[PDB]
Design a protein around this ligand. Structure first.
Ligand SMILES: *C1=C(C#N)C(=O)C(C)(C)[C@@H]2CC[C@]3(C)C(=CC(=O)[C@@H]4[C@@H]5CC(C)(C)CC[C@]5(C(=O)OC)CC[C@]43C)[C@@]12C
Ligand SMILES: *C1=C(C#N)C(=O)C(C)(C)[C@@H]2CC[C@]3(C)C(=CC(=O)[C@@H]4[C@@H]5CC(C)(C)CC[C@]5(C(=O)OC)CC[C@]43C)[C@@]12C
Lengths: 130, 129
């Protein structure tokens, strides 16, 4: 007959493997230069595919049909490198933690990239504190 | 304290987006010229990263200091173009289905690529029947 297999935790474990690959600075086809006022530039390396899977705004960045000898390194202004880190991390972990006092800056970054899943999480939280 | 948030769906959802991006030849960074028997070259276009996430053998191919960030071509012997396809599917869908005619032949590709998950599930069904 016809045989079918589905491995349920496959999307989980392949991500942490992909996330390893990031931490390993391996297979990374983009490097993010996150400039925030006087804070010294922080370099975040990643794979475009994973960013583009987790951000609409990033998908449009790489699949803009406009790239050649360039755009390997992208300039991020107006995010604090530690906010951006937890965003980028959320893309690879599916989870985010943040000391509750910067929820609105993590919300503000997440909007910049349309991480609508945490933009809700963070706004709900903000509202409960009131 | 710390505010924490997880979105279990994200791993299912993101991979669908990459399978989309795969199916559109959007951010595909590698092309697998699968050359089996006298069947001519069959192109499979994919992203090294997703391939590397599913197959220990594939990660090994790419992190083998290829040093080649451009589009790579990769000639593939020993796997039928249609067995290769069934795995590339597992890579992005997390699932795979074939008739019993090829359950063993697809098992060989999964063995060739250390997809120990379908290797097992291939074997089990073979044993059941
Ligand atoms: C706040 C946290 C908490 N609790 C965190 O968990 C973070 C994610 C580590 C976060 C990183 C971003 C900054 C450094 C931050 C708190 C701040 O006060 C920072 C300020 C906010 C503001 C409004 C005072 C001016 C910008 C600034 C900054 O430039 O100072 C470094 C941005 C970064 C941040 C929001 C924590 C530590
Ligand atoms: C059998 C399927 C089934 N059911 C499939 O769904 C596959 C995975 C698409 C599979 C692709 C590979 C071949 C073409 C195949 C049927 C076969 O029997 C083919 C034979 C197997 C064998 C041992 C009889 C001799 C080699 C050969 C072949 O005929 O070369 C083209 C290899 C390919 C395949 C296993 C299906 C369609």
């Amino acid at each position: 007959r016809t045989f079918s297999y589905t491995l349920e935790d496959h999307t989980k474990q392949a991500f942490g493997v992909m996330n390893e690959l990031r931490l390993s600075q391996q297979l990374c086809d983009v490097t993010l230069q996150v400039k925030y006022e006087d804070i010294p530039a922080a370099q975040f390396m990643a794979h475009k595919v994973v960013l583009a899977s987790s951000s609409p705004v990033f998908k449009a960045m790489f699949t803009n049909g406009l790239r050649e000898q360039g755009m390997e390194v992208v300039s991020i202004e107006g995010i604090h490198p530690k906010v951006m880190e937890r965003l980028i991390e959320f893309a690879y972990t599916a989870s985010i933690s943040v000391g509750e006092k910067c929820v609105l800056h993590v919300m503000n970054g997440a909007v910049m990239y349309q991480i609508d899943s945490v933009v809700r999480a963070c706004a709900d939280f903000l509202v409960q504190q009131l």
